[PDB]
């Protein structure tokens, strides 16, 4: 992945969600978009992209997932980088976002060279 | 500018800023610490950092202002190394510490990327 930083356009990425748990679920992955934000510790899916029976345990008002969900970024061109695994933070955001708990996973840095 | 995204560790730099404007203020130049955020559109300065003198304007989810003068904002690297400046009005507001946003961020030539 490599992105150029511009004012006007948010850094978006799509993204598949996998609930890897053992209980039924309508829709095991779905696909979502999210941004990529430097300034978030940790990736928060917003209620609207999450699917409603995956479960969540109990400023920023949020739950976790209570399944370990197995996210794989999708670029531009189709192309998928790494899956990783994490818990992810849900809340009421305007969007996704995908935290440095993930641009670690994936191996960015913000460069000029 | 290079910096590794770490999930523990923010990705903060230190900048000069410097108050270009056309009238007095106790300090013309102040350093300060701030956020690289390629997820804010716009560069904000927390209340908590912003000279107290410098002046700010009402502009036209968290309330915000406006610098009223220009501002020169210097990028210091990790090395004491200097990015080349930047002249923006920043905004200012209640928020836990500055940030540059993608305005500065395509202004420093930056991109993120794992190649």
């Not at 955001?93 to 995908?98: C, E, N, P």
Request: aromatic share 4%; net charge neutral; proline share 6%.
């Amino acid at each position: 992945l490599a992105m150029t930083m511009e004012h006007k356009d948010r850094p978006l990425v799509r993204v598949i969600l996998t609930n890897t748990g053992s209980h039924p679920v309508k829709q095991r992955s779905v696909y979502i978009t999210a941004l990529l934000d430097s300034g978030a510790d940790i990736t928060i899916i917003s209620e609207e992209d999450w699917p409603t029976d995956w479960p969540v345990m109990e400023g920023i008002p949020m739950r976790k997932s209570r399944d370990m969900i197995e996210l794989g970024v999708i670029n531009r061109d189709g192309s998928l980088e790494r899956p990783l695994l994490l818990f992810p933070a849900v809340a009421m955001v305007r969007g996704s976002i995908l935290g440095r708990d993930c641009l670690q996973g994936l191996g960015l840095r913000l460069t000029n060279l």
